[PDB]
Ligand binder design. Sequence first.
Ligand SMILES: Nc1ncnc2c1ncn2[C@@H]1O[C@H](COP(=O)(O)OP(=O)(O)OP(=O)(O)O)[C@@H](O)[C@H]1O
Ligand SMILES: Nc1ncnc2c1ncn2[C@@H]1O[C@H](COP(=O)(O)OP(=O)(O)O)[C@@H](O)[C@H]1O
Ligand SMILES: [Mg+2]
Ligand SMILES: [Mg+2]
Lengths: 346, 173, 594
Amino acid sequence: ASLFLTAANRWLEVRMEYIGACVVLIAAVTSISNSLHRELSAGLVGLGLTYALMVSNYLNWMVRNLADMELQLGAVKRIHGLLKTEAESYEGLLAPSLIPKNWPDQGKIQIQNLSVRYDSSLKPVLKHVNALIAPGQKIGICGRTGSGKSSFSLAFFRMVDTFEGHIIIDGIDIAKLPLHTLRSRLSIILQDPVLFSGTIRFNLDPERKCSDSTLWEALEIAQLKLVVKALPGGLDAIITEGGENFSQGQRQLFCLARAFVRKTSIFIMDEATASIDMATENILQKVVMTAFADRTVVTIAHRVHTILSADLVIVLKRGAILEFDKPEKLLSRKDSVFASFVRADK
Amino acid sequence: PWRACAKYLSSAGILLLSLLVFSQLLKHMVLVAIDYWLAKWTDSADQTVYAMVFTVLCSLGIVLCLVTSVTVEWTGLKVAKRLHRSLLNRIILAPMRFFETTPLGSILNRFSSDCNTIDQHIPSTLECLSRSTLLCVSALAVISYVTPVFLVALLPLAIVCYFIQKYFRVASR
Amino acid sequence: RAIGKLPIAMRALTNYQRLCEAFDAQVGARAIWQALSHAFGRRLVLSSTFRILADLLGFAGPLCIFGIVDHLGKLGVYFVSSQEFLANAYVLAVLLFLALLLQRTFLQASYYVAIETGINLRGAIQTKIYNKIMHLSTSNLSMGEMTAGQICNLVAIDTNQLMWFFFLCPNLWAMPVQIIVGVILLYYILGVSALIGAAVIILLAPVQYFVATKLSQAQRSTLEYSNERLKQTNEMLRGIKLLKLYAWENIFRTRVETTRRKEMTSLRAFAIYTSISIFMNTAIPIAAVLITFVGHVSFFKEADFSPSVAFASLSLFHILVTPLFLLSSVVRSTVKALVSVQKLSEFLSSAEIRDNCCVQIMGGYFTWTPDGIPTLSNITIRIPRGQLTMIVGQVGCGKSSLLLAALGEMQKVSGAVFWSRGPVAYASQKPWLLNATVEENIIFESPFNKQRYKMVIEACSLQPDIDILPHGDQTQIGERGINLSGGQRQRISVARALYQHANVVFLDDPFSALDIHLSDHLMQAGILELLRDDKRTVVLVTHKLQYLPHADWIIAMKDGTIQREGTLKDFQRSECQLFEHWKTLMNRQDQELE
Ligand SMILES: Nc1ncnc2c1ncn2[C@@H]1O[C@H](COP(=O)(O)OP(=O)(O)OP(=O)(O)O)[C@@H](O)[C@H]1O
Ligand SMILES: Nc1ncnc2c1ncn2[C@@H]1O[C@H](COP(=O)(O)OP(=O)(O)O)[C@@H](O)[C@H]1O
Ligand SMILES: [Mg+2]
Ligand SMILES: [Mg+2]
């Protein structure tokens, strides 16, 4: 394809410079005919012959730079086609001094008839759910895969669109909020490990706001202090691109340690206990249920025994809330979805 | 003419663009005046006025070449600045549904090769394009000056130029 | 199609066969340049000799000006002489036309053979970059030292920069012979008044030395800031989900804006030296006509101010000025070739790869680092034929690295490796996708057989996920195409490693991104069902210890070593503290593990 584009680009220029040499010939013969039987000058014929030589010197640069300006202007057209994309409308409808300074003082998450989709052309992924959580409650959510349980934690943050429902936290609706104030005062942790390069002190503190004492306590409560003390950077150790200096569970624990820096009242979690070992998972569950005792934590469980010590269990299936009670109250009853989840484990 | 040259001129503005077209236009008009004064100088057979007008007109040529080179590099630096810092600030406010639909290597290919084309490869090509076609139309203007018989020869070369250019461009695309 | 196939001399594997024969008789970047000149000297000197033969034929232009307007200023009875023949305007215009036809077609043949040399160079060093890639260890990628975007950036904007240098370098080779024969023709037309203009032609060496060395360090700092900007942009936009959810995008936008600001400082430096290179290369001939026409009618005896020597000298200065305009792009692509060959030889000198039982690693020592303490200490494993094994440990204790030592991707400090190496089927903790169809992802260049294909779809339960896909099975996924769940690509990567017909099937945590039901379907229709019936050896590190009763062997790891190997009764007999730690962990305290 480069050789045929080459041979086309020499074919056009060999025809066009044949036409340019014919321009030299016809300007030469009409200037010597008009200096033969008429009188122009001497020097005007030499000027016309010189610039007739110049247009054969420069016609290939005219046609080749016009083709190169078209081929390089296509990149400006593609950058402008990317540049006309949409936005998110980060500024909300509520006034920016209506909020307090400590906005999430407690957890009063009211789920009032919520239903989300992903896009404008597909189904409601969640049906009409309804909940209200007391502000000390270390609740959990289980369910099947594809049930929307990651999508409900995305629906906390308005990542998906809430086409009906009023999610109200502490007397303040989520949809009337500025989004930087929303997603700065609320801490998700995802299932997938996402880890940038640079270092650990860049990675937990990207904007240079915390001391090393709360960072080393965040490394202590992520069951992680011993390997950062073994690695010879000493908080300035280089994590590489994608986190490929470390293991996959070490990437997950570094992501959980970046969740533990920002002290909000709500630590919504997805399955960050997925793809780590069960011993440090259960030791980490006892560590996060001694540390964040005043904080509401909401987890999505990958394993059904770390949701066994939760306050309430919300089993989601196919868009709707199926069970909503204490875990032993859902265990001691009828052969249900949560009872078959703990039965199919053991 | 596409929309991309319109967005190229709108990102360049008016202030560098007027100097961009007019420094090039007087930069070729000074050279046509230089050898037209040389063609006045060859029919001598009044002395040492021609060499002084030649010296001050090549001084006008070197200062128009100077202001032409810094105005093409000043619009290269200005559109190299301002086609960044708006693409970055209109991809940094994009929703997550946009990233879930579009392939990520297409957006990184836009950020690598097309921005590399905009900062490096475009304004040297713009200098050789403007200088080559303005030397070409000054060559056609001064070959129409010395004879009227080229003006009835100009139409077959232009119609075979337009026919061979359109007949090539349907293969080249 | 009908562009067609290619010629045999323009083939890659014929190109790079000539470069590998030029890689021999070399026993570094100078060695890379010596292999490139020994591989591609002949077509490059054919391009350069076509640019010898054009532009020396290009100097019949001002010779015909010097014929024609010297004529227009003005036995042996029907014969004409050669001086009568070469002072007539019609035959000098016809000779000018034939010389200009032959000069433009030799210029086009020179441009063709230089672009054909650059295309064969691009094919040969593309498969040389790939032949370095297939021996390349992961330890020069995992602990820094390049990124995958940098290795793609090699073939993106360094192979094409060396290709554009091989486009442009016959103009470098046949520039100065045109300069020295053009100034001899300037001496032939008007004599020693043009030797004043020889001083401003010999004054290009500061503006080819100082300007190009300032452009050299400007372009090196430009490419260092641009690789910093592209690496920060690529690590920004893959993590755009966590970057938007944490609201950190203004911080990362500030970081790449400072990287773009330092890159714009180096672009300002490259810009100012490019602009004065364009200014000097177009400002010396218009000074040269000024100094030759003040040297004509002052400081010298006015020998001949004709129109003939005036327009012959101005046409000769315009064909002395029109090859001069390219030289900033010539030194631009020259220094981009020099940093291309320097980074290419830095990439090409990187580190590389070195009893009814398959694998018999006895006493091995393994290190991720080339010069570090070993992450794997003394291991003695035995992986039996046809039987499942499991690797159980904590976080960071050698479990995926034991597999990567057994693949050979780890460097081997000590110990021995014994197999039967055959083909091992393998799916990592991070799943890996192609940008082909989902049926091409599962099959992975095997023969397509729909019964085994239906067995591995309905084994690991992909049929509602194929039913939610818009073209069904023929959707293309990956980086191009349609993005996926995260739980889909784990099953796609482990469903690729059941179709392999390979006896050793390594697994590296397949039950991370799934729930209990699809893991039970993979335990009860995928593994222990398809792989017992072939008696294929499977190795599966997990933390799901509910499936540890379905195990023929247990490897226990902690802190880079193996604590014990054997069976579950062997861990019941003597490793009872770890057995009771598993028993308190599993919460099957009423029952036994068997
Ligand atoms: N790509 C790598 N480069 C350098 N060191 C690594 C790499 N991967 C892992 N390591 C080191 O080797 C040790 C063992 O990690 P390993 O590769 O076994 O992951 P793992 O323990 O299997 O992960 P998980 O516990 O999540 O299954 C880790 O402590 C880590 O520090
Ligand atoms: N980015 C997306 N765009 C459109 N649809 C999605 C997207 N992610 C998931 N879905 C669909 O919506 C459902 C949401 O489930 P999700 O929360 O993603 O996983 P889980 O199975 O853990 O609930 C899935 O069945 C999937 O088909
Ligand atoms: Mg989910
Ligand atoms: Mg691992």
